[PDB]
Design a protein around this ligand. Sequence first.
Ligand SMILES: *[C@@H]1O[C@H](CO)[C@@H](O[C@@H]2O[C@H](CO)[C@@H](O)[C@H](O)[C@H]2NC(C)=O)[C@H](O)[C@H]1NC(C)=O
Ligand SMILES: *[C@@H]1O[C@H](CO)[C@@H](O[C@@H]2O[C@H](CO)[C@@H](O)[C@H](O)[C@H]2NC(C)=O)[C@H](O)[C@H]1NC(C)=O
Ligand SMILES: CO[C@H]1O[C@H](CO)[C@H](O)[C@H](O)[C@H]1O
Ligand SMILES: CO[C@H]1O[C@H](CO)[C@H](O)[C@H](O)[C@H]1O
Ligand SMILES: [Ca+2]
Ligand SMILES: [Ca+2]
Ligand SMILES: [Mn+2]
Ligand SMILES: [Mn+2]
Lengths: 236, 236
Amino acid sequence: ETQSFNFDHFEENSKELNLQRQASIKSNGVLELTKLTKNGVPVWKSTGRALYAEPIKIWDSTTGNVASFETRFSFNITQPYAYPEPADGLTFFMVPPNSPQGEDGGNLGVFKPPEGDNAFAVEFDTFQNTWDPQVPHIGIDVNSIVSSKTLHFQLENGGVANVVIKYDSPTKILNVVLAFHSVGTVYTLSNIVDLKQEFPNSEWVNVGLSATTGYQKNAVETHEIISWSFTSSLQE
Amino acid sequence: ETQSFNFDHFEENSKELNLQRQASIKSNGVLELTKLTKNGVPVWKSTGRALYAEPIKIWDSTTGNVASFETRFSFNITQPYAYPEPADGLTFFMVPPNSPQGEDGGNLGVFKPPEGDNAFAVEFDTFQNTWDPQVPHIGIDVNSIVSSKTLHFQLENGGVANVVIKYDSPTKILNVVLAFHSVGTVYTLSNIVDLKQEFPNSEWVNVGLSATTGYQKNAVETHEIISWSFTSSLQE
Ligand SMILES: *[C@@H]1O[C@H](CO)[C@@H](O[C@@H]2O[C@H](CO)[C@@H](O)[C@H](O)[C@H]2NC(C)=O)[C@H](O)[C@H]1NC(C)=O
Ligand SMILES: *[C@@H]1O[C@H](CO)[C@@H](O[C@@H]2O[C@H](CO)[C@@H](O)[C@H](O)[C@H]2NC(C)=O)[C@H](O)[C@H]1NC(C)=O
Ligand SMILES: CO[C@H]1O[C@H](CO)[C@H](O)[C@H](O)[C@H]1O
Ligand SMILES: CO[C@H]1O[C@H](CO)[C@H](O)[C@H](O)[C@H]1O
Ligand SMILES: [Ca+2]
Ligand SMILES: [Ca+2]
Ligand SMILES: [Mn+2]
Ligand SMILES: [Mn+2]
């Protein structure tokens, strides 16, 4: 009925977090989603994803009940330069098991252009593509990079962000709270999302974090995750 | 289309804030909702309310649109003693114009027993009455002191709390974020509320803060508001 996991820090070679592409783990006990320099020389078009080994069940076929979950994590985004404009963003996401990876850059390594991929994600977009509003912003992506609801927030460069994503099965209310404590700012964005109806092909989904850097040179930024807890609660 | 007000501090004798009962304004530029001692001797059964002079419009009869508002405020609750247990709580609330005052203590000076008063309020209950869950908790009161949704939170004694109450007319999603920055804690509670259906007798409502202390000696705490901004935005 309940699935949980908590990372107060990130230990190297954990049998719990399954890393992909540029994503590695710093000796610091930090999860680094995208490299800023590989082999001494600066790079771009970097993409890093990190999933949780076990599939989380979001709804029951027999019972017909949808899970309620809450996940929290701290991240640190540093944007070194002012020109060219930094990119692309960081994002929490849920996809069905054994599902293709998303494109780089703008799609945050989660979504693909042809309407094929089935995914959900809460994004922290730092770059304004053709479909984006002023950046940076918080976005609720339901099967598309185009957020169904967004919120502009002022990023604290190199500061520690505290995120909370809470979803209540009964009210189908997805909520996102972004707060920068070291400065006293809080951002809250919430919209209605019908999980059962949006992931009808798998009662199970993989949960993970992802980030990506620009397509040009220097259109990059750091994407570090400091901690990350999760917990679903499926009744019935 | 838009009504706003902001108090980065509280000036004495402002023509924008109709104070009621025990509620006064300290010289430090703080709004003190309930006195802990009057003239030198300790007291209880204290009740303080503070409204905003102008009525805020929440919905339009003709167009049919409901307003969307967001209000933030910082408060400081200090509970001096451990026995007897402290009471009662602090709360943001909306009532129709020219409406009666609620009862002391448990009703937070907002609601009355006989189902007569029409009101809404986000409460920060510090005392567990017969209808309450473990305290302290955040509660969403829709026409009753019995919250339709609640959330237990650990209070930081004498610390500054940052509250955010955001309501989105289109999704009818009421959200409450309570965060104690000095410690790194965030609490988020959200439930669905149909403002237009819950205040059908007045397109207008008075907005205000309120607090109350126990019914017994020493079952008291301080209720200070440091800042408080609001903003509705009714389309059409
Ligand atoms: C946020 O991320 C930046 C980038 O990783 C951190 O800055 C780096 O600090 C390390 C020391 O641990 C240096 O070796 C790097 O050269 C720094 N990078 C840059 C671009 O300056 C920063 O320390 C992080 N902030 C926190 C609080 O963890
Ligand atoms: C909350 O308000 C209370 C009441 O003013 C503050 O507590 C006082 O703290 C001062 C020290 O600055 C003492 O001199 C008083 O004796 C305290 N009063 C009581 C009743 O204990 C408290 O510091 C405020 N909290 C914050 C974060 O400012
Ligand atoms: C013009 O857009 C392209 O380059 C920027 C960097 O400048 C971002 O990487 C974006 O996602 C990509 O599509
Ligand atoms: C037994 O309850 C009564 O006393 C406590 C204090 O002990 C509170 O004031 C409460 O609101 C009131 O109804
Ligand atoms: Ca983007
Ligand atoms: Ca109570
Ligand atoms: Mn976006
Ligand atoms: Mn209560």
